[PDB]
Amino acid sequence: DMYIERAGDITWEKDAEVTGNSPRLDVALDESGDFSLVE
């Protein structure tokens, strides 16, 4: 039996920890909603 607890507001927070790259990827989506790397 799952339950939910609030974890915060949905807001854009100016000066947040800016990280991560921006890769372009060829992918296939199956009927099970699993993504996979098409190479």
Partner: protein, 156 residues
């Protein structure tokens, strides 16, 4: 129960301790999450019960109490913030520029941020604070690092 707009942890007691299995957004009285988090199962919010209303395993999405409410899209240019909510840890905005899932059916935003699976459902924001999709469905690349789609539902 709590029906206040905002982001939420999805918890189970069916394992050891209380375990965060995912995250979701309450908006306009509707709770939005990823299908793989709840498997369409019902949810508790106080005594309050949430019942599934819409769901699609292929989109890996599901809404409770009403139809999918979130129609905002990545504009293809601007940066965005994963409002990540990890297990046992406080909500925390991470700003990033999305990459791209190129698929036979089209291009999807993707965010290269690595977080425990319990973060699945954490929302992704545009600069006006609108939710443009949910993190936690995607792919592992060469490195061993996780890349997630910006998964958005269709609103009516």
């Amino acid at each position: 129960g709590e029906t206040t707009d905002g982001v939420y942890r999805v918890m189970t007691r069916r394992l050891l301790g209380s375990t965060q299995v995912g995250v979701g957004v309450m908006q306009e009285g509707v709770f939005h999450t990823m299908w793989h988090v709840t498997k369409g199962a019902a949810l508790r919010s106080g005594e309050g019960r949430l019942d599934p209303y819409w769901g699609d395993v292929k989109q890996d999405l599901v809404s409770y109490c009403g139809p999918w409410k979130l129609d905002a899209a990545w504009d293809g240019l601007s940066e965005v913030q994963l409002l990540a909510v990890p297990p046992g840890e406080r909500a925390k905005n991470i700003q990033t520029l999305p990459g791209i899932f190129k698929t036979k059916d089209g291009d999807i935003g993707a965010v290269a941020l690595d977080y425990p699976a319990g973060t699945s459902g954490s929302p992704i924001l545009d600069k006006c604070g609108r939710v443009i999709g949910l993190y936690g469905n995607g792919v592992v690349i060469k490195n061993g690092s996780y890349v997630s789609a910006i998964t958005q539902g269709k609103r009516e």
